Amino acid sequence: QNLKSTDRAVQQMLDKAKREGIQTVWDRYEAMKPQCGFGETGLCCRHCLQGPCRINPFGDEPKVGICGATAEVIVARGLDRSIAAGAAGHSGHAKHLAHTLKKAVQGKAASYMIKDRTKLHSIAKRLGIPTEGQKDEDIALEVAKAALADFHEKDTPVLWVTTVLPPSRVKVLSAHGLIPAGIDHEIAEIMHRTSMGCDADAQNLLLGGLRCSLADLAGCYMGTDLADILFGTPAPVVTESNLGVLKADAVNVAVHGHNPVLSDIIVSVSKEMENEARAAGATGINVVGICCTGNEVLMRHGIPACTHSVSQEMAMITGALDAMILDYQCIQPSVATIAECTGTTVITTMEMSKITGATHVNFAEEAAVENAKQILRLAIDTFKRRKGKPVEIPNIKTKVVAGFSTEAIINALSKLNANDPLKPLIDNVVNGNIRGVCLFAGCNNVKVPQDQNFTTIARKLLKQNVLVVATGCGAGALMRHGFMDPANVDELCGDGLKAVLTAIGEANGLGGPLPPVLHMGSCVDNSRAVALVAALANRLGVDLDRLPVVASAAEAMHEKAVAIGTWAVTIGLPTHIGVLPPITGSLPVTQILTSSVKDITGGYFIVELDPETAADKLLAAINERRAGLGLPW
Amino acid sequence: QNLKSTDRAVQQMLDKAKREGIQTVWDRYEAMKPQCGFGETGLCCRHCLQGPCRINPFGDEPKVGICGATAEVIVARGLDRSIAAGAAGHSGHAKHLAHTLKKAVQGKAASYMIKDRTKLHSIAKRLGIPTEGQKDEDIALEVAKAALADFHEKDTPVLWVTTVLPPSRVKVLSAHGLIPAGIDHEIAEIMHRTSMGCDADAQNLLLGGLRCSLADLAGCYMGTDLADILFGTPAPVVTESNLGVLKADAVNVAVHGHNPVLSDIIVSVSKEMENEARAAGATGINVVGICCTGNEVLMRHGIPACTHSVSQEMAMITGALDAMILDYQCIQPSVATIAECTGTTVITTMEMSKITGATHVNFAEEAAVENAKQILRLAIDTFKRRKGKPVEIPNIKTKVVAGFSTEAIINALSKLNANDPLKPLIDNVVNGNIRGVCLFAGCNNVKVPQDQNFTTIARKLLKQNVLVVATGCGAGALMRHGFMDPANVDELCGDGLKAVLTAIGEANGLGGPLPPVLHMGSCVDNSRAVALVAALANRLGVDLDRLPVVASAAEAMHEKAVAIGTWAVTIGLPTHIGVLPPITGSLPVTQILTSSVKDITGGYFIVELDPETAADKLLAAINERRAGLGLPW
Numbered sequence A, B: 001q002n003l004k005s006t007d008r009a010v011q012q013m014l015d016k017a018k019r020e021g022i023q024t025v026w027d028r029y030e031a032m033k034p035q036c037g038f039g040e041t042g043l044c045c046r047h048c049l050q051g052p053c054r055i056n057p058f059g060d061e062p063k064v065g066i067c068g069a070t071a072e073v074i075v076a077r078g079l080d081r082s083i084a085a086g087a088a089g090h091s092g093h094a095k096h097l098a099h100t101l102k103k104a105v106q107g108k109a110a111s112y113m114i115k116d117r118t119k120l121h122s123i124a125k126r127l128g129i130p131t132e133g134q135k136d137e138d139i140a141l142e143v144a145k146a147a148l149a150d151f152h153e154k155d156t157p158v159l160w161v162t163t164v165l166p167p168s169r170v171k172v173l174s175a176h177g178l179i180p181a182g183i184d185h186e187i188a189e190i191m192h193r194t195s196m197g198c199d200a201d202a203q204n205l206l207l208g209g210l211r212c213s214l215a216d217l218a219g220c221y222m223g224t225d226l227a228d229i230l231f232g233t234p235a236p237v238v239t240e241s242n243l244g245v246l247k248a249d250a251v252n253v254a255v256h257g258h259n260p261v262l263s264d265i266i267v268s269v270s271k272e273m274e275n276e277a278r279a280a281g282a283t284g285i286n287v288v289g290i291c292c293t294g295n296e297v298l299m300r301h302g303i304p305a306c307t308h309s310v311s312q313e314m315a316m317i318t319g320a321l322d323a324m325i326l327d328y329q330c331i332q333p334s335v336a337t338i339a340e341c342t343g344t345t346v347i348t349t350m351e352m353s354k355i356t357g358a359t360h361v362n363f364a365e366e367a368a369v370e371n372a373k374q375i376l377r378l379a380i381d382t383f384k385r386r387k388g389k390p391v392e393i394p395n396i397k398t399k400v401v402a403g404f405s406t407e408a409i410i411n412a413l414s415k416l417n418a419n420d421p422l423k424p425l426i427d428n429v430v431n432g433n434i435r436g437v438c439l440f441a442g443c444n445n446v447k448v449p450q451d452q453n454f455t456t457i458a459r460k461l462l463k464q465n466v467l468v469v470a471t472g473c474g475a476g477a478l479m480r481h482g483f484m485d486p487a488n489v490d491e492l493c494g495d496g497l498k499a500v501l502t503a504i505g506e507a508n509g510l511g512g513p514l515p516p517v518l519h520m521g522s523c524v525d526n527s528r529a530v531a532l533v534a535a536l537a538n539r540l541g542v543d544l545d546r547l548p549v550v551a552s553a554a555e556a557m558h559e560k561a562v563a564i565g566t567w568a569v570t571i572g573l574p575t576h577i578g579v580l581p582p583i584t585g586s587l588p589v590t591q592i593l594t595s596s597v598k599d600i601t602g603g604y605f606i607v608e609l610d611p612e613t614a615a616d617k618l619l620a621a622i623n624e625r626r627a628g629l630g631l632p633w
């Protein structure tokens, strides 16, 4: 099973699924082989009813689409629609939070409130909204109105792009016409220009894709900002991860999907319902996380992470998962079918994300506590139904220190330099104790043995003194293999990095180091890494494409991860992707995305499926940035 | 060549392309055979990097996508993205016109103006915008602001849906949650819900698709409304169609694409440049139309139509096409390559629609006359380069009476009943002289011998006394085969229909009938057919799903035609599609779209590739509506 996942708890559940005859994502992948080589290379188009069209990567006809679309047009149009789909997911998420904040401060959703007033005021000031002598509710109404205004054209560009990057980077982007006019405006313009008989020039298409990726960045940054206002900015927390966080004698409830508007309420209301659970024979309600909504409640409340991404079905295979509470994105719809076998109650809550065979309980923010109570009573009823049933929870878990928002990182560094917190970090980049920074982001993918690329690349970078930060299911992979436990610093980190993590943790009163990898949150919280990187660029007086900072979507899957990788390149970063994207059928498009975009934005993709080689390429990219700053490497 | 096109001028140019070795759309189709059966049936998904996934229509594995997506989820998600892409094209078009109207009345684009003040005031009143004592420019600013507001969420739904359909139809739609919240909002929500791990219930997905099709209807109706304000509402005109409208001794300039913001200015400025053309040795500038922008200037100015849709390359093959002036949509990018062989100057003008190898001349409304002059001087230079070169213009053309806006149809009928213009039409539906109404819409498609389904179905319906209206390249097909020449009424029309067309034409002073088919304009001007049908439903006090009115996208191609067919079903019409849509891989989705949607909206798709059978099915749908009104049939 180690060919499927490197996680030992997942391996144990794969054995259980096998002997019980429950089909998994790895079995559905095996049944799909061999996969179509036209789609793998990007050489397929279904954008009109004269299709499907394809182009042979090599050989004879077909060489061109029926309307005359070339390989480079077809590959660029498909990539652009992927970017637009990812932007559409993050900005649906962000819009959901904007409408929740508006409702809250208008007295229409009493379950929600302004928790981080300090963040509210800093965002308002960044946006140019006056705060002095204003009521908090009025300030918040204006921030929610500004959030919703960024979805359409208006007399300013998207402010969650132009106010969050340094002016020099905004100027580079503006010079190439890449600043978005409105988030949903760009998504629609992508779908237009990629439709039949429209844009048919690869460079023009890809410039439109870079602009739409910045609409995705705006939706990510907006979602972090609004979730911090409503639910609190994360601070360091300790918890646990992997399937051993499930408890046979508890009501086990996973929150899965993305939006904390739902997850955060499940967590607080589950606390009020402890006695009701105990009357049912349980010890209480054990809320556990899956995917990004799990990261959101891990970061803010220390809720333990059960599993992530490709292995999500395995939590159900234990037999102890009483409920799986869903909103949207990254939920394998197989869960509705596996539930019939495992007894889990799978519950959907959003009108635009239903799964045939799952129970639907409408969740309205205006009725959030009552709707949560209804959902959790379903969970309790399910617990009661499995009294006396054996379960198989692998007794496997790791310790996880997390909660490293950019505010938390700056506060930690301020213990070493109160009025110039970024300087101790920059000092140690200059003296070589920190070689550079790498952000691990994005999904697992069934084509890659689960977590193998994240852990292989992270181990090599940590030994080379790279400061490693992580989000999403990249953070999930690293946490489940011990990379967020400070007890593993001696084993994993080079001496320079160890000295730095130790000096910071000791200054913060822990009698020990920060963990080997800093968890910066969910996938929208890739925006927190942008805030940190932009702050370092501003402090140094250089643009982001001069910093020794890289990114790695080492096991990418979702269209959201394609959008995030593309805005990482657009803001100036060398960005690794560890799975094959559907671009190899066009050498001109590949050369744009891996080489000539450097002359436009300073960033570039690094496509490399072998993780040791990928680590070497990421180190060479870091070191080339060090050399360009005049630093040893 | 008659297996490729039923148009004799196209056949002649196919012979020329063959002996000159110029590859055409029919040759690129032959080189694509056999096409992929997964894509033909809809059983392919590339929505994440674990793909491509496919499902065998029949047999053994694969049976399900890797994430667990079923055939019915995969088929519904692909259809929904098609609908969203079509909506994105029509609402880009409509947004372009809204920004042009705003610029005009703000003094920022003097080449444009309020031409139809009567239309401006009626639209304002429909929208609830006060006009009394207001300046026209202020009224127009408010209508342009209302147009742009319909792209995003606000405190009202999309008004270019809710104010253009009767209240009883809006109520049906609202009860099913199908009224759009904002045009670009719905496009983004489609791209979100169809991304991996989101909506996975076929009925839920398709309900979202119906709602997004009404966002497409809003963009079509908005584009007709704003183009009529700026350029005038069409009235009856006489002109000609087919390749014989090209003139060897003139500068031949085709306008191709969609938006009259560009086409209409080319037409008026070409008039001022007659002397400059003559100094170059030409008789003048001969502007001719291709596709919908050609329909726009045919309807308003009587500009002759050269060709349409699938045969667009053939205008270039004559050797006499000096320039092809493009904005966006439905332009085969092959034209840039064929230009190298034929000498034509292909010119793009919009930033989001470029074609490698074509000349780009930015067109800005603020500089429209100068930008047009630059473009037309390129055309004149090209004319000069082909002095002494033989050309081969087939001497084949038809007479075309067109310009039947809904206002023009009502005015014509008012000659028979001044204060109740719709009554003479309803009288003749009741007495059987008019059996019902059929709208032909949409494209040609290279899989169908060009025009064969339009002409075959139209002939059978006209003999059965159906009033036939047409738009887009359906109107193009019918005009090129003589169906818009009143000299062909005796041959084509049944006695009842002939009596009606004759009584109306004689009352309008023509000493003869209206033509056999009424040209209602471009593809956005399918909205004019909605206005007529809604007016008849209001006059009769019934909803649209009780009227003997059907639609036929007999040779559909573009994602726009999929969106239009879907809103035709959503507003209550039996809607034929004459090509195979990628739905047959899911029987549950096919049964929803061809049968159970009747219980939701009263409309339904009729998929039928054999045009005689399709005509019989359309007549049976008309007659079933007659029976439901208590009428003989």
Ligand code: SF4
Pocket: A045, A046, A047, A048, A049, A050, A051, A052, A053, A065, A066, A067, A068, A069, A195, A196, A197
């Ligand atoms: S848009 Fe062009 S390449 Fe794509 S399916 Fe249609 S004819 Fe084929």
Ligand code: SF4
Pocket: B045, B046, B047, B048, B049, B050, B051, B052, B053, B065, B066, B067, B068, B069, B195, B196, B197
């Ligand atoms: S979304 Fe599901 S069906 Fe589609 S490519 Fe990804 S794994 Fe396959």
Ligand code: FES
Pocket: A036, A037, A038, A039, A040, A044, A045, A052, A054, B036, B039, B044, B046, B052
């Ligand atoms: S031919 Fe396989 S993805 Fe289209």
Ligand code: FES
Pocket: A036, A039, A044, A046, A052, B036, B037, B038, B039, B040, B044, B045, B052, B054
């Ligand atoms: S397998 Fe051919 S369209 Fe994907």
